[PDB]
Design a protein around this ligand. Structure first.
Ligand SMILES: CC[C@H](C)[C@H](N)C(=O)O
Length: 344
Protein backbone atom coordinates (compact mmCIF):
# COMPACT_ATOMS: atom_id res chain seq x y z
CA UNK A 1 0.00 0.00 0.00
CA UNK A 2 0.81 3.70 0.07
CA UNK A 3 3.95 5.11 1.68
CA UNK A 4 3.40 8.42 3.47
CA UNK A 5 6.04 11.17 3.25
CA UNK A 6 5.62 14.47 5.07
CA UNK A 7 6.50 17.57 3.02
CA UNK A 8 6.99 20.42 5.52
CA UNK A 9 7.61 24.09 4.84
CA UNK A 10 6.26 27.63 4.78
CA UNK A 11 2.83 27.18 3.13
CA UNK A 12 1.65 30.47 4.62
CA UNK A 13 3.21 33.52 6.22
CA UNK A 14 5.78 36.06 5.00
CA UNK A 15 8.00 33.55 3.24
CA UNK A 16 5.30 31.32 1.68
CA UNK A 17 7.29 31.56 -1.55
CA UNK A 18 9.76 29.01 -0.08
CA UNK A 19 6.91 26.54 0.55
CA UNK A 20 5.58 27.09 -2.99
CA UNK A 21 8.90 26.08 -4.52
CA UNK A 22 9.13 23.13 -2.18
CA UNK A 23 5.66 21.75 -2.87
CA UNK A 24 5.99 22.22 -6.64
CA UNK A 25 9.19 20.15 -6.62
CA UNK A 26 7.76 17.51 -4.31
CA UNK A 27 4.55 17.16 -6.27
CA UNK A 28 6.32 16.60 -9.60
CA UNK A 29 8.85 14.15 -8.12
CA UNK A 30 6.13 12.07 -6.51
CA UNK A 31 4.09 12.06 -9.73
CA UNK A 32 7.19 11.05 -11.74
CA UNK A 33 8.19 8.34 -9.26
CA UNK A 34 4.70 6.85 -9.03
CA UNK A 35 4.29 6.83 -12.83
CA UNK A 36 7.40 4.67 -12.98
CA UNK A 37 5.97 2.21 -10.47
CA UNK A 38 6.48 3.78 -7.05
CA UNK A 39 8.66 1.89 -4.58
CA UNK A 40 8.46 -1.71 -5.77
CA UNK A 41 4.88 -1.15 -6.87
CA UNK A 42 4.08 0.86 -3.72
CA UNK A 43 2.81 4.38 -4.33
CA UNK A 44 4.27 7.40 -2.51
CA UNK A 45 1.94 9.97 -1.06
CA UNK A 46 2.76 13.44 0.16
CA UNK A 47 1.23 14.76 3.37
CA UNK A 48 1.57 18.55 3.39
CA UNK A 49 2.34 20.37 6.68
CA UNK A 50 2.60 24.15 7.07
CA UNK A 51 5.16 25.33 9.62
CA UNK A 52 5.03 28.94 8.29
CA UNK A 53 8.81 29.03 8.86
CA UNK A 54 7.89 29.86 12.47
CA UNK A 55 9.96 28.04 15.13
CA UNK A 56 7.06 27.41 17.49
CA UNK A 57 4.83 26.10 14.72
CA UNK A 58 7.68 23.91 13.34
CA UNK A 59 7.87 22.26 16.78
CA UNK A 60 4.09 21.71 16.69
CA UNK A 61 4.37 20.23 13.22
CA UNK A 62 7.22 17.88 14.19
CA UNK A 63 5.15 16.51 17.09
CA UNK A 64 2.13 16.12 14.80
CA UNK A 65 4.17 14.19 12.20
CA UNK A 66 5.37 11.83 14.87
CA UNK A 67 1.84 11.44 16.18
CA UNK A 68 0.49 10.89 12.66
CA UNK A 69 2.82 7.92 12.38
CA UNK A 70 4.86 9.31 9.44
CA UNK A 71 8.53 8.20 9.46
CA UNK A 72 10.05 10.25 6.63
CA UNK A 73 10.05 14.02 6.42
CA UNK A 74 11.02 16.01 3.40
CA UNK A 75 11.67 19.29 4.83
CA UNK A 76 11.36 22.07 6.86
CA UNK A 77 12.99 24.97 5.12
CA UNK A 78 14.07 27.79 7.46
CA UNK A 79 17.06 27.03 9.66
CA UNK A 80 15.53 28.34 12.88
CA UNK A 81 12.44 26.19 12.25
CA UNK A 82 14.31 23.13 10.97
CA UNK A 83 16.66 22.86 13.96
CA UNK A 84 14.15 22.54 16.79
CA UNK A 85 12.13 20.16 14.60
CA UNK A 86 15.23 17.99 13.97
CA UNK A 87 15.62 17.62 17.79
CA UNK A 88 12.24 15.92 17.90
CA UNK A 89 12.84 13.81 14.77
CA UNK A 90 16.18 12.53 16.07
CA UNK A 91 14.57 11.67 19.47
CA UNK A 92 11.65 9.93 17.78
CA UNK A 93 13.42 7.92 15.06
CA UNK A 94 12.09 10.00 12.17
CA UNK A 95 14.16 10.53 9.03
CA UNK A 96 14.46 14.19 8.01
CA UNK A 97 15.89 15.46 4.71
CA UNK A 98 15.90 19.26 4.40
CA UNK A 99 16.00 20.70 0.86
CA UNK A 100 16.66 24.25 2.10
CA UNK A 101 18.06 24.72 5.63
CA UNK A 102 21.66 25.97 5.38
CA UNK A 103 22.83 26.91 8.91
CA UNK A 104 25.82 24.69 9.84
CA UNK A 105 24.67 23.97 13.38
CA UNK A 106 21.82 21.74 12.21
CA UNK A 107 24.33 19.02 11.33
CA UNK A 108 27.07 19.79 13.86
CA UNK A 109 25.42 18.01 16.80
CA UNK A 110 25.90 14.30 16.22
CA UNK A 111 22.47 13.57 14.76
CA UNK A 112 22.24 10.48 12.59
CA UNK A 113 18.80 10.88 10.97
CA UNK A 114 19.30 14.34 9.48
CA UNK A 115 20.44 15.04 5.88
CA UNK A 116 20.33 17.89 3.39
CA UNK A 117 19.94 18.36 -0.37
CA UNK A 118 21.27 21.93 -0.15
CA UNK A 119 24.64 23.38 0.91
CA UNK A 120 26.06 25.04 4.04
CA UNK A 121 26.42 28.69 4.97
CA UNK A 122 29.95 27.88 6.06
CA UNK A 123 30.44 27.72 2.24
CA UNK A 124 27.84 30.29 1.13
CA UNK A 125 29.24 33.04 3.39
CA UNK A 126 32.90 32.69 2.23
CA UNK A 127 31.77 32.52 -1.39
CA UNK A 128 30.15 35.94 -0.99
CA UNK A 129 33.13 37.36 0.92
CA UNK A 130 35.60 36.12 -1.70
CA UNK A 131 33.53 37.59 -4.54
CA UNK A 132 33.28 40.96 -2.82
CA UNK A 133 37.03 41.00 -2.18
CA UNK A 134 38.01 39.93 -5.70
CA UNK A 135 35.39 41.19 -8.09
CA UNK A 136 33.48 43.98 -6.35
CA UNK A 137 36.26 45.73 -4.41
CA UNK A 138 33.90 48.21 -2.67
CA UNK A 139 35.27 51.01 -0.47
CA UNK A 140 32.71 51.47 2.31
CA UNK A 141 30.79 48.37 3.33
CA UNK A 142 27.90 47.89 5.75
CA UNK A 143 26.55 44.46 6.78
CA UNK A 144 22.90 44.09 7.82
CA UNK A 145 20.96 41.02 8.98
CA UNK A 146 17.59 40.09 10.48
CA UNK A 147 18.84 38.60 13.75
CA UNK A 148 17.80 35.05 12.77
CA UNK A 149 20.06 32.01 12.76
CA UNK A 150 20.27 32.00 8.95
CA UNK A 151 20.72 35.69 8.20
CA UNK A 152 22.86 36.64 11.17
CA UNK A 153 24.98 33.51 10.63
CA UNK A 154 25.75 34.51 7.02
CA UNK A 155 26.28 38.13 8.04
CA UNK A 156 28.89 37.08 10.63
CA UNK A 157 30.61 34.79 8.09
CA UNK A 158 30.81 37.58 5.54
CA UNK A 159 32.11 40.03 8.16
CA UNK A 160 34.84 37.60 9.17
CA UNK A 161 35.90 37.00 5.57
CA UNK A 162 35.91 40.71 4.80
CA UNK A 163 37.88 41.61 7.94
CA UNK A 164 40.38 38.93 7.03
CA UNK A 165 40.77 40.56 3.61
CA UNK A 166 41.17 44.05 5.15
CA UNK A 167 37.91 45.43 3.79
CA UNK A 168 36.45 48.56 5.43
CA UNK A 169 33.22 47.50 7.16
CA UNK A 170 31.71 50.76 8.46
CA UNK A 171 28.93 49.05 10.43
CA UNK A 172 27.36 45.71 11.25
CA UNK A 173 23.83 45.72 12.68
CA UNK A 174 20.56 43.84 12.68
CA UNK A 175 17.00 44.88 11.80
CA UNK A 176 13.76 43.10 12.80
CA UNK A 177 12.13 40.61 10.48
CA UNK A 178 8.74 42.00 9.55
CA UNK A 179 10.00 45.60 9.50
CA UNK A 180 8.77 47.70 6.57
CA UNK A 181 10.16 51.09 7.59
CA UNK A 182 13.88 51.19 6.78
CA UNK A 183 14.16 54.98 6.84
CA UNK A 184 16.85 55.13 9.53
CA UNK A 185 18.82 52.45 7.66
CA UNK A 186 18.56 54.26 4.36
CA UNK A 187 19.58 57.50 6.10
CA UNK A 188 22.63 55.86 7.69
CA UNK A 189 23.72 54.34 4.40
CA UNK A 190 23.41 57.81 2.85
CA UNK A 191 25.11 59.70 5.68
CA UNK A 192 28.03 57.26 5.94
CA UNK A 193 28.46 57.09 2.14
CA UNK A 194 28.06 53.28 1.96
CA UNK A 195 28.74 51.97 -1.54
CA UNK A 196 28.17 48.28 -0.71
CA UNK A 197 25.78 46.34 1.54
CA UNK A 198 25.58 42.61 2.22
CA UNK A 199 22.18 41.67 3.69
CA UNK A 200 21.88 38.32 5.45
CA UNK A 201 18.22 37.38 5.44
CA UNK A 202 15.06 36.68 3.44
CA UNK A 203 13.28 38.42 0.55
CA UNK A 204 10.56 40.36 2.34
CA UNK A 205 13.11 42.53 4.16
CA UNK A 206 15.56 42.70 1.26
CA UNK A 207 12.80 43.82 -1.11
CA UNK A 208 11.82 46.77 1.04
CA UNK A 209 15.41 47.74 1.71
CA UNK A 210 16.03 47.85 -2.04
CA UNK A 211 12.97 49.95 -2.87
CA UNK A 212 13.60 52.55 -0.17
CA UNK A 213 17.31 52.74 -0.86
CA UNK A 214 16.62 53.47 -4.56
CA UNK A 215 13.78 55.86 -3.79
CA UNK A 216 16.30 57.84 -1.67
CA UNK A 217 18.62 58.11 -4.65
CA UNK A 218 21.21 55.67 -3.28
CA UNK A 219 23.53 54.02 -5.84
CA UNK A 220 24.71 51.45 -3.25
CA UNK A 221 25.44 47.93 -4.57
CA UNK A 222 23.58 45.28 -2.56
CA UNK A 223 24.30 41.55 -2.17
CA UNK A 224 22.25 38.81 -0.50
CA UNK A 225 22.16 34.97 -0.06
CA UNK A 226 19.86 32.45 -1.77
CA UNK A 227 16.95 33.31 0.55
CA UNK A 228 16.70 36.54 -1.43
CA UNK A 229 17.06 35.05 -4.91
CA UNK A 230 13.46 34.45 -5.94
CA UNK A 231 10.52 35.96 -7.82
CA UNK A 232 8.95 37.36 -4.69
CA UNK A 233 12.01 39.60 -4.22
CA UNK A 234 11.50 40.86 -7.81
CA UNK A 235 7.80 41.40 -7.27
CA UNK A 236 8.44 43.50 -4.17
CA UNK A 237 11.41 45.54 -5.34
CA UNK A 238 10.46 45.84 -8.97
CA UNK A 239 13.16 47.70 -10.87
CA UNK A 240 15.06 48.18 -7.59
CA UNK A 241 16.14 44.52 -7.82
CA UNK A 242 18.13 44.92 -11.03
CA UNK A 243 21.80 45.00 -10.17
CA UNK A 244 21.45 42.90 -7.03
CA UNK A 245 24.24 40.35 -6.50
CA UNK A 246 23.20 36.99 -5.01
CA UNK A 247 24.74 33.65 -4.05
CA UNK A 248 22.51 30.68 -4.86
CA UNK A 249 22.45 27.06 -6.09
CA UNK A 250 23.14 26.50 -9.78
CA UNK A 251 20.17 26.92 -12.20
CA UNK A 252 19.21 23.23 -12.37
CA UNK A 253 16.14 24.12 -14.47
CA UNK A 254 18.63 24.96 -17.25
CA UNK A 255 20.23 21.51 -17.27
CA UNK A 256 19.06 19.96 -20.61
CA UNK A 257 18.24 16.59 -19.06
CA UNK A 258 15.78 18.33 -16.69
CA UNK A 259 13.70 19.91 -19.46
CA UNK A 260 10.90 17.31 -19.29
CA UNK A 261 10.43 18.18 -15.65
CA UNK A 262 10.48 21.90 -16.44
CA UNK A 263 7.90 21.38 -19.22
CA UNK A 264 5.71 19.25 -16.98
CA UNK A 265 5.69 21.92 -14.30
CA UNK A 266 5.07 24.80 -16.74
CA UNK A 267 2.36 22.60 -18.22
CA UNK A 268 0.62 22.86 -14.81
CA UNK A 269 1.05 26.67 -14.75
CA UNK A 270 3.55 26.38 -11.87
CA UNK A 271 6.93 28.02 -11.52
CA UNK A 272 9.88 25.67 -12.11
CA UNK A 273 12.54 28.35 -11.74
CA UNK A 274 13.00 28.40 -7.95
CA UNK A 275 16.01 26.54 -6.54
CA UNK A 276 13.92 24.71 -3.94
CA UNK A 277 11.85 23.11 -6.68
CA UNK A 278 15.05 21.22 -7.61
CA UNK A 279 16.58 20.60 -4.15
CA UNK A 280 13.18 19.27 -3.06
CA UNK A 281 12.72 17.09 -6.15
CA UNK A 282 16.25 15.78 -5.43
CA UNK A 283 15.34 15.05 -1.80
CA UNK A 284 12.38 12.89 -2.93
CA UNK A 285 14.76 11.05 -5.28
CA UNK A 286 17.14 10.49 -2.35
CA UNK A 287 14.31 9.19 -0.19
CA UNK A 288 13.28 6.98 -3.13
CA UNK A 289 16.75 5.40 -3.38
CA UNK A 290 16.70 4.63 0.32
CA UNK A 291 13.11 3.29 0.46
CA UNK A 292 14.16 0.78 -2.16
CA UNK A 293 16.65 -0.63 0.35
CA UNK A 294 14.77 -0.30 3.61
CA UNK A 295 11.80 1.23 5.36
CA UNK A 296 13.79 1.96 8.54
CA UNK A 297 14.95 5.59 9.01
CA UNK A 298 18.41 4.80 10.39
CA UNK A 299 19.09 2.23 7.64
CA UNK A 300 18.00 4.75 4.99
CA UNK A 301 20.34 7.42 6.40
CA UNK A 302 23.20 4.90 6.57
CA UNK A 303 22.49 3.76 2.98
CA UNK A 304 22.50 7.31 1.59
CA UNK A 305 25.73 8.19 3.38
CA UNK A 306 27.40 5.10 1.88
CA UNK A 307 26.09 5.60 -1.68
CA UNK A 308 25.61 8.39 -4.20
CA UNK A 309 22.14 8.94 -5.61
CA UNK A 310 21.63 10.36 -9.11
CA UNK A 311 19.17 13.27 -9.04
CA UNK A 312 18.01 16.32 -10.97
CA UNK A 313 20.91 18.09 -9.23
CA UNK A 314 23.40 15.55 -10.54
CA UNK A 315 24.85 12.76 -8.34
CA UNK A 316 24.64 13.56 -4.64
CA UNK A 317 27.03 12.18 -2.00
CA UNK A 318 26.73 12.75 1.77
CA UNK A 319 29.33 12.83 4.58
CA UNK A 320 28.58 11.09 7.95
CA UNK A 321 26.80 14.11 9.43
CA UNK A 322 24.36 14.39 6.49
CA UNK A 323 25.83 17.20 4.40
CA UNK A 324 26.32 17.21 0.63
CA UNK A 325 29.98 16.84 -0.35
CA UNK A 326 31.25 19.35 -2.92
CA UNK A 327 28.09 21.48 -3.06
CA UNK A 328 28.78 24.98 -4.40
CA UNK A 329 26.78 28.19 -4.38
CA UNK A 330 27.28 30.34 -7.46
CA UNK A 331 27.31 34.17 -7.65
CA UNK A 332 24.65 35.65 -9.90
CA UNK A 333 23.19 38.97 -11.00
CA UNK A 334 19.47 39.06 -10.18
CA UNK A 335 17.05 40.97 -12.42
CA UNK A 336 13.65 42.67 -11.99
CA UNK A 337 12.87 39.87 -14.43
CA UNK A 338 12.99 37.27 -11.68
CA UNK A 339 15.87 35.62 -13.50
CA UNK A 340 19.55 35.15 -12.61
CA UNK A 341 22.64 35.37 -14.79
CA UNK A 342 26.13 34.35 -13.81
CA UNK A 343 28.00 37.35 -12.41
CA UNK A 344 31.33 38.24 -14.01
C1 LIG B 1 14.38 28.48 2.64
C2 LIG B 1 15.71 28.37 3.41
C3 LIG B 1 16.24 29.73 3.85
C4 LIG B 1 16.29 30.63 2.61
C5 LIG B 1 17.66 29.57 4.47
N1 LIG B 1 18.52 28.74 3.57
C6 LIG B 1 17.54 29.02 5.90
O1 LIG B 1 18.24 28.02 6.23
O2 LIG B 1 16.76 29.61 6.70
Amino acid sequence: EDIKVAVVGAMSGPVAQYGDQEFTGAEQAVADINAKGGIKGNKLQIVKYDDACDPKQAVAVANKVVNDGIKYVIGHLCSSSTQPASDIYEDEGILMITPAATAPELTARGYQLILRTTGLDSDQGPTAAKYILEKVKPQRIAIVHDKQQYGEGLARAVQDGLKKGNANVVFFDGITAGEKDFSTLVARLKKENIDFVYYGGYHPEMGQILRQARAAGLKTQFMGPEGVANVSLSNIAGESAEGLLVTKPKNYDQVPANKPIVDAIKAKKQDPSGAFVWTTYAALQSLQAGLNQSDDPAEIAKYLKANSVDTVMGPLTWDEKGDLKGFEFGVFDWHANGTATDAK
